[PDB]
Scaffold this active site. Structure first.
Site, short mmCIF file in Angstrom:
data_model
loop_
_atom_site.label_atom_id
_atom_site.label_comp_id
_atom_site.label_asym_id
_atom_site.label_seq_id
_atom_site.Cartn_x
_atom_site.Cartn_y
_atom_site.Cartn_z
N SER B 197 0.86 -1.20 0.00
CA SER B 197 0.00 0.00 0.00
C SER B 197 0.88 1.23 0.00
O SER B 197 1.44 1.45 -1.08
CB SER B 197 -1.05 0.02 1.13
N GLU B 324 -9.45 -4.90 -2.79
CA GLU B 324 -8.74 -3.77 -2.26
C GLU B 324 -9.66 -2.71 -1.67
O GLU B 324 -9.25 -2.02 -0.74
CB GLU B 324 -7.92 -3.08 -3.37
N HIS B 437 -7.37 -5.80 1.38
CA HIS B 437 -6.21 -4.97 1.30
C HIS B 437 -5.32 -5.26 2.51
O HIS B 437 -5.84 -5.14 3.61
CB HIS B 437 -6.59 -3.53 1.32
C1 LIG Z 1 -5.13 -2.97 5.54
C2 LIG Z 1 -4.50 -2.22 6.75
N1 LIG Z 1 -3.27 -1.33 6.52
C3 LIG Z 1 -2.55 -0.97 7.85
C4 LIG Z 1 -2.25 -2.11 5.64
C5 LIG Z 1 -3.69 -0.05 5.88
C6 LIG Z 1 -4.16 1.07 6.55
C7 LIG Z 1 -4.51 2.25 5.89
C8 LIG Z 1 -4.38 2.32 4.51
C9 LIG Z 1 -3.87 1.22 3.82
O1 LIG Z 1 -3.79 1.30 2.47
C10 LIG Z 1 -3.54 0.05 4.49
#
Ligand SMILES: CC[N+](C)(C)c1cccc(O)c1
Ligand SMILES: CC[N+](C)(C)c1cccc(O)c1
Lengths: 527, 527
Positions: B197, B324, B437
């Site tokens: 990400s 996602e 995601h």
């Molecule tokens: C899926 C959780 N994670 C911590 C990886 C997260 C949190 C906020 C935005 C993102 O794209 C991913």
């Protein structure tokens, strides 16, 4: 005598015609107006002066002056649509098929031929009302109207060439049926008007024109609706094409009067020779002289009339063929040819969509392309071919028709929607063309009953079923004597018309028609 | 001793950690910069002053100050992503897992945590490099960078808060790996940077930033690409959000100096409390403080850099998860809730698309809706839910990524594309969220190998296969030791990553990405 009929216009003498293993009466070539020749050219039709003595109605009349399709000399697929009788400006006549013994008060069916408003003949073999008249005990009437510049040249504001006179020709014949069909055994209060393509659009226009709604009771629209992108032009556009026509004939363009005077001196073929040169765009499925939204015949825009319920409320039976676009691609899109499979390149496709949606900007073209392209296989020639077929059909026939039925059904008394997806077994057109525009007609008129035409048994049955559906609907406002469901705005049901056991479906080509009826129009207005 | 390492910054003492049925070395919490506290807040990082004596690297470091997800108190699905160590501005540290016996010159893997640039921790359980280090004999490095306002507040033109300093934090750690990883058995010339990400976007940004390309050899991008709509803002926007942040803290806004001075006096949580109030739109998948296209770190627009080949040419391995968007809908779209099936109404859908594409005009929204709506069943709640999931995923992750790979592959030395569509068997998130995601990560880091986590046998195998694919690719530039095909602009092949026998597909979500990458952008520019 059953072949002598007395009418308010004079006595008429029909002829006995053999039909299957019986016979029926036919009154061919009854005049319903004064010949629109000489200085009458372009003028509203005049009621036919009553005559003395017996009018011989034993033989088909002349066809109106029109562009003759010579694209496939001697090929029946296209010649069968061409005029089969001398062409003449003196062509306002009607034909009547009457059951034998002459009925007392039966359902009347009035056929309005299609042909893009530039061509059309009531005398075609596929339009022979004897099988329908005879099989369904209906009085079958077929009318004629001026096509091309002769019926639709429009110099709005002038009375010499007001526009829509071909629509008035239909009205006039409708007027004559209204007033004289009782003498032939027909009930003037149960007159169903039906037509295909421009005929179907004509029908819908009669439904909308105040001056026409009282002349008939029910309507059948085949692959045509009054709001089709090619069925009408603005009065400004009608005027521009009239001048352009004059320009092409080296006419004085100083005034309407001079312009019209010049056009009346021209021989019919001279106008026909340059008719296609006035289209404003390079395009397919666009005809030069069509109905104009004049403020008379059509009080306001068709869409405001459709939105406000400003139209005759009755029962309507309408539908489309599976491959409405195929025919037009063949005659005007690059890459298509009669004798090949017409696999289409992405280059040809892109130029195809441009011809199909002539008024779109590049963004519009992109929206169309995105919508009809399989991006996982964008070089597939079959898929590009077929996608183009759908583009032309969806935009010119199916979605405009779907918009019409949805607006109509809000205020009408019964909508019945069909989808004809049966390819005749004896079709001479290439297989890629599919279920071609105009090919439900032979089924509606019962050609599959004449064995020597070599249709299958199943096709005879389908014809009989369609004829019965059409005649029954004309008689009672309902196709049904399984069941052909009512089309409702909520359920949107419709039926398939093919040799297989009818199936009921919902929302005919929704996805695409939302694209054509809502999204594209919004796009082109925004941009 | 294998746990004592001498570096150019000072001596470091690691700790021996058990891994499966063996052990490995871990150097946790090595400082790679000066603590960015006090008047250093918002400033570019400073290299860590060499130290004397042995640095105790036996325990994880502090996590950077960040927004803590309290939306589901005590729920592991979301708490596992939250900081698991004291939070502190003093958080620029790195962690190294080294095979035992210490290798001489092996492949180095540098993990960059994602989290929308507002959150993220190197110390999470899912980021434990011991299984990967141990299983694939790689030196696993995990770095940390300042998130939120602390790492991305950008007052372009000022040197006190230039913007991108969280990206510089990564660079700095990369610099330190470059210069000291040889002492841990790692080969500084075979350093693969990988992240998910925002981590994945970070990777792609390092590939583009001239000042970073020489610090590593290969890149792995997971559900993130530098051109994602949420990965960067203009310097004007970065400035506007900085002022807005100041506005929310009642800061003097007369000058950058006053503004920054006020922001440095604030306690960390004060900035975090009002961080989400500066977004310009009501939206999902949009974060406040992100990388700015400043002209320094990023010489020109990412797109012109991508078009001109202005980026490091190497091998890249990248991909996306099947769902996602699900995670973001759950936290910010109406109608979605953790404990229901989240069937979505057409009303909620329409408001969902508005949150998803915040910059679109109504026409844009209509284009999106048309594209993702099944008009034959537009009231289906499952279909609206799923369609929305795809909208969010397609627009924020998958299509931007697909655009990136297509631009990259024109000039790069090898593109490998995966599609992870396996839902872990022990997932605590509702089934409707799908292959969420961030959920490829536990597979990449080998959590499925620790039996007590209760993954299936097939999931152990998939983890081993992914780890081997990732480690092998880092080692040689090719995932393969059936075959994971090269991604080419002509064939566009990619593979599936799931417990089933890998399958090769082509053109990942083409139809939709043409819509997001070509058509929508053209639409919004036209209008
Ligand atoms: C899926 C959780 N994670 C911590 C990886 C997260 C949190 C906020 C935005 C993102 O794209 C991913
Ligand atoms: C299909 C042939 N037919 C004569 C019916 C025809 C011709 C031109 C335009 C049309 O819509 C239809």
């Amino acid at each position: 005598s059953e072949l002598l009929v007395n009418t308010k216009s004079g006595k008429v003498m029909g002829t006995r015609v053999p039909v299957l293993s019986s016979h029926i009466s036919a009154f061919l070539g009854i005049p319903f107006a004064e010949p629109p020749v000489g200085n009458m050219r372009f003028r509203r039709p005049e009621p036919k002066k009553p005559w003395s003595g017996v009018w011989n109605a034993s033989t088909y009349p002349n066809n109106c002056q029109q562009y003759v399709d010579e694209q496939f000399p001697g090929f029946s697929g296209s010649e069968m649509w061409n005029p089969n009788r001398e062409m003449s400006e003196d062509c306002l006549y009607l034909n009547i098929w009457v059951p034998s013994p002459r009925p007392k008060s039966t359902t009347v069916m009035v056929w309005i031929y299609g042909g893009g408003f530039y061509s059309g003949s009531s005398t075609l073999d596929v339009y022979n009302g004897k099988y329908l008249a005879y099989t369904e005990e209906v009085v079958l009437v077929s009318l004629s109207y001026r096509v091309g510049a002769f019926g639709f040249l429009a110099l709005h504001g002038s009375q010499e060439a007001p526009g829509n006179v071909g629509l008035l020709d239909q009205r006039m014949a409708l007027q004559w049926v209204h007033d004289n069909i009782q003498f032939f055994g027909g009930d003037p209060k149960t007159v169903t008007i039906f037509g295909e393509s421009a005929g179907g659009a004509s029908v819908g226009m009669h439904i909308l024109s105040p001056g026409s709604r009282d002349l008939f009771r029910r309507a059948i629209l085949q692959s045509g609706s009054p709001n089709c992108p090619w069925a009408s032009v603005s009065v400004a556009e009608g005027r521009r094409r009239a001048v352009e026509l004059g320009r092409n004939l080296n006419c004085n363009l100083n005034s309407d009067e001079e312009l019209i005077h010049c056009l009346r001196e021209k021989k019919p073929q001279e106008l026909i020779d340059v008719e296609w040169n006035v289209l404003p765009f390079d395009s397919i499925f666009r005809f030069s002289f069509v109905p104009v939204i004049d403020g008379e015949f059509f009080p306001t825009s068709l869409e405001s009339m459709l939105n406000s319920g400003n139209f005759k409320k009755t029962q309507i039976l309408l539908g489309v063929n599976k491959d409405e676009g195929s025919f037009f691609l063949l005659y005007g899109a690059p890459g298509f040819s009669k004798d090949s499979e017409s696999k289409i390149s992405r280059e040809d496709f892109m130029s195809g969509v441009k011809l199909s949606v002539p008024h779109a900007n590049d963004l519009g073209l992109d929206a169309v392309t995105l919508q009809y392209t399989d991006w996982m296989d964008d070089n597939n020639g079959i898929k590009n071919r077929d996608g183009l077929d759908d583009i032309v059909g969806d935009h010119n026939v199916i979605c405009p028709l779907m918009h019409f039925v949805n607006k109509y059904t809000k205020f009408g008394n019964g909508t019945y929607l069909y989808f004809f997806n049966h390819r005749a077994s004896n079709l001479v057109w290439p297989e890629w063309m599919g279920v071609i525009h105009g090919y439900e007609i032979e089924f509606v008129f019962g050609l599959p009953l004449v064995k020597e035409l070599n249709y299958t048994a199943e096709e005879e049955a389908l014809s009989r079923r369609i004829m019965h559906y059409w005649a029954t609907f004309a008689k009672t406002g309902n196709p049904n004597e399984s069941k052909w469901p009512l089309f409702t705005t909520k359920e949107q049901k419709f039926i398939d018309l093919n040799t297989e056991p009818m199936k009921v479906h919902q929302r005919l080509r929704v996805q695409m028609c939302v694209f054509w009826n809502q999204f594209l129009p919004k796009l082109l207005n925004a941009t």
